[PDB]
Design a protein around this ligand. Structure first.
Ligand code: ATP
Ligand code: ADP
Ligand code: DXP
Ligand code: DXP
Ligand code: XUL
Lengths: 492, 490
């Protein structure tokens, strides 16, 4: 008779579930991982059966923790995944994740003929192999057999929900990650379907994130430890949910998350695409569009620098301590952070990192700090593509392990020159999934109400003096990036 | 029993070496003197201080033996500039090659096409180290002292003048003023007129082997020598370091890398570079020193040793770098930390690591520094020898070249044998040799080989040489990409 909501987050490498009480308070969480399938270089698949097994296990463990009813289970999910089902609804492929680069040549050719540009103009999908549309084109050319027998092309969230309810439905924000969803109609682009040789019937139907998918099959009602009145809430993408999950529900705010990798995002009231296709535009509904830049080179690069500049015994705190002994701007040392190639803002998979501007004045602290500043400059570079000459947002709602320290929080404030707002809850995705459930159940109505759950913790205002230093130094960062932009192909 | 003293009048210190009659060094002594840096770019020294050190050293060396000093010969720093007044007293300190006062004057001359003209005429690269540019600067902003200067000379000239009363320079030293005409081997009249300087205000020019006599009696006593002790005019450190490693003709190259570095070769006629990337300094009618002075040698190694790593010894650094593959997984290090002269001639240059990946760990970065220092020297050497036959070997010296590792690396990158020398002190050795020529004890320059012996030889490993041959174009691509970006870091 006490009611609860479970929010699920179906990520690459692991799913996390959070159990929330009817006041929105998290009362427990459980997560379980699965291996990535990387036989060959560029390969990045996972077994949908394993993921679904983790899902049942997580939900069961959560329900074991309480004596009450699960009113709803809502979903946040990785984007861009692709799975083929045959006519018997059986798996024809693994889940081909966003990180699989099998379509990389397909994209390059599309880019040369002006096709990738057209897909971007139609769907808001950047010219990158992560998209289902490019993977489908690759499959159709190089794996004719499976392409022939595929009757459904879906993502992992659709797969999971299908196993639970026998229904095949995707939400708008997830269709937004296929590269097939038309920005203006918010249904599949007919021209692109024709080129794909895919029929609308071979794709899930599109509904709103709050749609209740009912009923769950009795089998799984038992296995999951739930009621026959437990609802499935369709849910949404991790990108969208992570954004509203930090209360960045409109264009006055941006969401900056930086963990191993990073992302800058904002929600606008109409489709808006970039002439240089430097950021994605993923619809959420007719009056909300998610703009953003996924950025590879976040804390993963901080980690590389920590181990390389020092040694594998240097703590993150030790590194930060040393970096802080250099002046703001690192005496003009520039670090381009593109260690793993880069998506936003430069969209060059061959890019590599650089230190430029060294002199005998640059000692360890200058190099350490340049790394941190470069990481943030890169993010500000991506953010600046979004904003352009529009209203600067009045705050950046910030999360992620790279932004743990006050030093980095303040540095972001100083470089972005807007206040940085940290959040009480880092698990923004399950939180916002939980919120969609509350909407479906009639417990909340307007989106803005998520603010009561997604609460702000600390605010960091730009220090005017340092902000000026960084404002003068950013153009030099861009000069060095520009100078080297055409030089990366050489390294390989 | 007769001995010869070879003197090396360097920046910050002078070193004397006493050689016996068979060219064997039997003792040495050195004395330092402060650099005068009141402001940025300034690099002066007090010539009286230097001359004091010279006397002490010579006296100290004489106190080490029972015999005669047959001769005292000179190897000297280049590009120094001292002005004397009508009373012959110092109007200025020795303004060394490192002094930057004339940097603006050079930039302007370079824009007007005059700096190019100076290079065409004299073989002097477009750089403020040159007396000619320092004179132009003085003429326009130190007009007082410019007005009263009756003699413009260098430190070697000052010393010999104090000892002897005679103002004499040798060809190799004249070659470093930026006023000596390549074709005539005398002061360039057109340049003299622009400077508004009369041939009389400059030392006479003589052969490096010319005996200057007599020595003033006051110094014969002070120095501990004889009335027949000969002063040999001597020559520049650059020229003497080259013949002092037995690199006497175009079939050889001299590579020295200590704190800084230099690549040099001697050819039989004037040769200048369309891009002016190397100097051409006459020694005589049929011998011209081509070279690149390279700032970023062991000084950059030392920076990396401390910055990348603690208190790593040089050997630890070497050990770590050797755990990286040849080519450092294609990581490029442009080593221009202190700006650069040869080969890029950009005082605003800075260093870079370009091509970083998570594959690049401490070993790759350490190794890329060493490869980059060497690539930079190979870049400068390549300017020298283009459109010519490669030298048959590189004659190598310097603390940076101490380890077999770096020696072998030089072989692999240059793709020519590296011959290391028994004698690192090439300058005073060649200075001593000059004295032997003047004393009649040697005739042909080629006989310097009897004294400057090879110690070891390193032959290119064809496998690694191939690797580096493929990597050098990438090093140049990155250098080229960034060449125009340095002015922005001010
Ligand atoms: N004190 C610190 N300052 C800056 N960065 C740090 C610090 N400590 C750890 N990191 C970085 O934080 C990163 C991980 O961030 P995070 O904790 O948000 O995990 P994630 O894997 O990116 O996302 P999630 O665990 O929610 O799935 C690493 O890449 C690491 O180098
Ligand atoms: N084992 C080594 N390997 C490479 N470089 C070294 C090594 N040891 C010292 N160095 C470098 O040697 C240089 C000095 O060269 P050296 O010829 O001995 O002195 P100098 O140029 O002042 O006459 C320094 O700049 C230092 O970093
Ligand atoms: C080829 C390789 O190095 C990969 O790690 C790849 O480049 C991924 O980079 P992007 O996600 O930016 O295209
Ligand atoms: C020392 C510093 O100020 C640098 O600018 C350096 O002096 C460059 O001089 P070079 O012209 O010899 O490269
Ligand atoms: O484009 C995106 C979302 O911003 C991808 O990088 C994410 O990894 C999806 O899970």
């Amino acid at each position: 008779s006490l009611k609860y909501i479970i929010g699920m987050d179906v990520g690459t490498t692991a799913t996390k579930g959070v159990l929330y009480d009817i006041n929105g308070k998290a009362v427990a969480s459980v997560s379980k991982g699965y291996p990535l399938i990387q036989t060959k270089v560029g390969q990045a698949e996972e077994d949908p059966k394993l993921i679904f097994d983790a899902v049942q296990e997580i939900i069961f463990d959560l329900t074991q923790k309480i004596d009450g009813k699960i009113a709803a289970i809502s979903w946040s999910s990785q984007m861009h995944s692709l799975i083929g089902l045959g006519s018997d609804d059986e798996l024809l492929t693994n889940s081909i994740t966003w990180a699989d680069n099998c379509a990389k040549s397909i994209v390059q050719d599309a880019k040369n003929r002006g096709f990738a540009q057209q897909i971007y103009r139609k769907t808001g999908m950047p010219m990158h192999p992560m998209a289902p549309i490019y993977k489908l084109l690759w499959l159709k050319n190089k794996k004719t057999e499976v392409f022939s027998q595929a009757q459904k092309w879906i993502g992992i969230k659709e797969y999971i929900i299908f196993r639970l309810t026998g229904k095949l439905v995707t939400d708008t924000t997830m269709a937004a990650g296929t590269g097939i969803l038309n920005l203006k109609t918010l249904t599949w682009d007919q021209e692109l379907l024709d080129i794909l040789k895919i029929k609308k019937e071979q794709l899930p139907k599109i509904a709103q994130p709050t749609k209740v998918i009912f009923p769950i099959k009795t089998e799984y009602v038992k296995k999951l430890g739930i009621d026959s009145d437990t609802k499935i809430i369709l849910g949404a993408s991790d990108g969208y949910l992570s954004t509203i999950g930090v209360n960045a529900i409109d264009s006055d705010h941006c969401a900056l998350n930086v963990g191993t990798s990073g992302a800058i995002r904002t929600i606008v009231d109409q489709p808006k695409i970039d002439p240089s296709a430097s950021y994605f535009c993923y619809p959420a509904d007719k009056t909300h569009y998610l703009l953003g830049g996924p950025v590879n080179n976040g804390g993963i690069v901080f980690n590389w620098a920590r181990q390389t500049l020092f040694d594998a015994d240097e703590t993150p705190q030790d590194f930060l301590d040393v970096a802080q002994t250099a002046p703001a701007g690192s005496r003009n040392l520039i670090f381009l952070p593109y260690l793993g190639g880069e998506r936003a803002p430069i969209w060059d998979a061959n890019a590599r990192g650089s230190f430029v501007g060294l002199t005998r004045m640059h000692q360890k602290p200058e190099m350490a700090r340049a790394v941190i500043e470069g990481i943030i400059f890169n993010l500000y570079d991506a953010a600046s593509n979004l904003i352009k000459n529009t209203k600067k947002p009045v705050a950046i709602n910030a999360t992620g392990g790279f932004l743990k320290s006050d030093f980095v929080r303040q540095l972001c404030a100083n470089i972005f020159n807007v206040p940085i707002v940290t959040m009480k809850e880092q698990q923004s995705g399950t939180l916002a999934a939980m919120f969609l459930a509350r909407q479906a159940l009639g417990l909340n109505q307007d989106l803005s109400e998520i603010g009561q759950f997604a609460q702000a913790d600390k605010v960091y205002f730009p220090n005017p003096k340092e902000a000026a230093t960084y404002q003068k130094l950013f153009p030099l960062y861009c000069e060095i990036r520009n100078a080297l932009a055409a030089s990366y192909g050489k390294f390989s």
